[PDB]
Amino acid sequence: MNTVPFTSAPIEVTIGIDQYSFNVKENQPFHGIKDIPIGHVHVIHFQHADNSSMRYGYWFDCRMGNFYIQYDPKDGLYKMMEERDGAKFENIVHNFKERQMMVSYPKIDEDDTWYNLTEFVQMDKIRKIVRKDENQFSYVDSSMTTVQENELSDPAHSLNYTVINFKSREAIRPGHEMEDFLDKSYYLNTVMLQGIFKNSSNYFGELQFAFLNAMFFGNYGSSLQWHAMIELICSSATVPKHMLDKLDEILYYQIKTLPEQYSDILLNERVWNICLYSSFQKNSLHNTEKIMENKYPELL
Amino acid sequence: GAMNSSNYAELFNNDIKLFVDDTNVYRVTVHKTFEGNVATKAINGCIFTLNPKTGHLFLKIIHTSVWAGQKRLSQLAKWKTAEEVSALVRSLPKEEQPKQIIVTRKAMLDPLEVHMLDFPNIAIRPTELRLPFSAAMSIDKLSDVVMKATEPQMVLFNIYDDWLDRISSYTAFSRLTLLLRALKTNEESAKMILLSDPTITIKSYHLWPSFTDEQWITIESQMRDLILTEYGRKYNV
């Protein structure tokens, strides 16, 4: 297990760690999060009590270094940093743990939720979507725009998701206009899977990362990307069976974890109704259809 | 955006544009089979592509062989329309290519946009205008060439005859729309209005009779009366 200490908590803030969250009061003696499960990426996120504008946070993997959080009063935010002095870091963590100034990552042994939401998400792929090579961890916030959004303005602060556009030459072979517009299988299997992503695991990892950024930060461009990656599969007549069954699992856990009161803003009615009831794969997502119909029947 | 009443004069500016109407591409008759089921029989159709400023009409005849062995024909017809409009654009010299294509039916938007991807600067626009171009097959010479076709064919016409020698494009489009609306509303009566006077003939190279300016005023008034009469008949008004 690993630990992300905090130097201090000078401003009142809601702190999230993966799907969990805790409120911290101004100058409360809070000094970090311990017992973080090794083997997965994680996200530590923030929403200031005095300004719910900008949710922001950091994707990280404790296998890649020793990370801590320190508030910067000039830039006004909690910043992740890497400590290169290993013995210094261990001494800090030990003293904070000995004083019981840290919250414990509250994972239930039976509970595979986080694994299910991050199964295909790798830190190395996160760092190619969020480009800041000097750090081993990646900052995302509520307002960051995607490369696709920018095309339709600060490039160094963009989310470099793979651009999906159903009315583009990339998606439509000359001579197959009707075929490829009505059946996206070419675009999915040859252009996206074989060409860009190389395999379905990388495709699913980006889909999962997009969902998580939409949910945890309210990042709109990420929600657009998540829906586009779903629609691309569902609108393809020819999809490998292992991908269809894995997609049903991925979406089931995403829909299960979504806050009930955020459905109006995080779910696109057109995409979900098309995917579950009209598309080629309308009958291939049994688990997702069942949870959607029982949890959000209004959307449909 | 969409072409409507507010931006009506745009149709007659110097930016090349074409209307595309697909209402006569896929034409069928419905009939009973020997076993008492229902079947369709296709007849030749056409794409109606018109420059409203100049009157140039690119009548692409859609021969029934196009449909042989194909499924979902009403859907395919929109894609075939878009394929043929794209082919027409590519065949035109650059300085003759349109800057906008206005589709009369919004279901043509996606098929045409997809076929026109190589032309990103040609705007594909819908219209809120109810345009009577489905009645093109009530123009005898157009119907005749479509029905006689034995293979795909493009035929070029000026749908305004020589009217632009005497009237503006605006007025010519008004006249055309009135005539087509009357033909759509009561074809038999509209044709009687146009053909009743034997001394007024249609030139070999024209579609409509050779009316003088004063005769066109009378004809247009008779067409308006026909449209109003039919409205009263339909709505019991």
Ligand SMILES: CCN(CCC(=O)O)C(=O)c1cccs1
């Ligand atoms: C008779 C002209 N007329 C349209 C019928 C036509 O197309 O000719 C019109 O002036 C307008 C239509 C929409 C706004 S104004």
